[PDB]
């Protein structure tokens, strides 16, 4: 499965002047574009080598819409400030995520379009791609305007059309790096905390995509409550890292076995402390 | 390619 997403962040800055608009684009776990209105002459920039194949007309097309969003979000921020009876002295944030998910056939599997205000859900497009879910009555004012403007219809046309078509174009242009699955390099480590209890750590390294399952077991029984899992982190070279830890009493080290599940692995690997 | 329409909230 493959996906394309755009992440928008619009922040009001009363001290600094005019609101700032940032847009980043992703194909799965790979970032390929960025825009920041905070420049004298802002422009869309490539962030993945397979997108540099696109000519100048593509970069102008992206810049024109992101300049429109800069203007649009300045008003959305002003309007939302009114709905919540907020002071103009305060800094606020509108965030938005939208995109398409494809299946194994190059067809729209699921469409998305969600908005947030000050870090909380605001308005989201439903799975039917024709109706909205508003978080409160302020979001219902936005919903009224968006229904009158037929925003769900505009989104359905895009998610079913241009979103899947361009995601397919990107998948083909970056085929060797986007349609490749990097399996994790696994190893188990031992770290004593006391004389009679030691932490067993299971490592997953250099994997792509970020989607991974790490589970600790006691003779084939899940240790869900006792297992300490760290949030999947980027290595900085487009690969990911993750580890799972368990406080194991001295002597019962060979008893514990860890299980790794990833797209790049044909069979889920079972690992134990060696030697 | 991004969505090419925006509507004030």
């Amino acid at each position, epitope marked *: 499965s493959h996906s394309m997403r755009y992440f928008y962040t619009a922040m009001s800055r009363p001290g600094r002047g005019e609101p700032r608009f940032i847009a980043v684009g992703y194909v799965d776990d790979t970032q390929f574009v960025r825009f920041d209105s905070d420049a004298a002459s802002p422009r869309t920039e490539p962030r993945a080598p397979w997108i540099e194949q696109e000519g100048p*007309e593509y970069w*102008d*097309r992206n810049t*024109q*819409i992101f300049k*429109t*969003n800069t*203007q*649009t979000y300045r*008003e959305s921020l002003r309007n939302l400030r009114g709905y919540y009876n907020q002071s103009e002295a305060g800094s606020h944030i509108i965030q938005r995520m939208y995109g398409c998910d494809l299946g194994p056939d190059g067809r729209l599997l699921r469409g998305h379009d969600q908005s947030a205000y000050d870090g909380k859900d605001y308005i989201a497009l439903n799975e039917d791609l024709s109706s909205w879910t508003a978080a409160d009555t302020a979001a219902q004012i936005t919903q009224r*305007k968006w229904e*009158a*403007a*037929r*925003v769900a*219809e*505009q989104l*359905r*046309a*895009y998610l*079913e*059309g*241009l979103c899947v078509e361009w995601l397919r174009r990107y998948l083909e242009n970056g085929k060797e790096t986007l349609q490749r699955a990097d399996p994790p390099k696994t190893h188990v480590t031992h770290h004593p905390v006391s004389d009679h209890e030691a932490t067993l750590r299971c490592w997953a390294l250099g994997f792509y995509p970020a989607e991974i399952t790490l589970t600790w077991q006691r003779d084939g029984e899940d240790q869900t409550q006792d297992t300490e899992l760290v949030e999947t982190r980027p290595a900085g070279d487009r690969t990911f890292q993750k580890w799972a830890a368990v406080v194991v009493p001295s002597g019962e080290e060979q008893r514990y076995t860890c299980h790794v599940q990833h797209e790049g692995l044909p069979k889920p690997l079972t690992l134990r402390w060696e030697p | 390619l991004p969505f*090419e*329409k*925006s*509507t*004030i909230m």
Partner: T-cell receptor
Amino acid sequence: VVSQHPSRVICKSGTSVKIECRSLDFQATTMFWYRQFPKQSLMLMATSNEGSKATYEQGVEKDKFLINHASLTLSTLTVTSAHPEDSSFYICSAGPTSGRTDTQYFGPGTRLTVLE
Amino acid sequence: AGENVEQHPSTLSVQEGDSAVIKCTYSDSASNYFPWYKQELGKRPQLIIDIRSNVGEKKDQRIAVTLNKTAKHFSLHITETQPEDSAVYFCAADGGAGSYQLTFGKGTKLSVIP
């Protein structure tokens, strides 16, 4: 809905006519100004942009038609030093969606008659 | 700027009760919004129907719109024509590069002889 004022104008040559275009129930970052001659077609003259300068179409005198995007609800068309050849039906349109143009709602039009 | 909308025919005469079809062609694939406007003499164009790139056909009473996105053309279908349908009809598309706008067709003067 979108409205216009005046709906009909009769003026002597040399006078300037200011035509308003208002979005009555939504905010518009863009408004479009058209000219309709006895030749039925909608000829786009200019695109009013908030708060940047207007985008004129090919074969449109910038100095004859002054477009100003006054606010998120009002755009004005000024026919400077009008002459009988400037007599036409001036109609505007606006819509709530910005970016790649979507549903447009037209004003009632302004009939301008310039007499010597 | 990179969008050209062609409306065929320029004029059309039909008998009250027969069907009328206006055909529009477009050039750009960024065109996803296809509105149809009806303009009576001395009056404003009114939106009567529209279609989007994800839909092949949309119907509303006697009015219908058809879209063929592969061949890049769309049609208005008026059935059981009434003399009140007599007006100038315009079609549009939202595609093309440069300045954002609806690219209109030149029009179709429809005449419904009672």
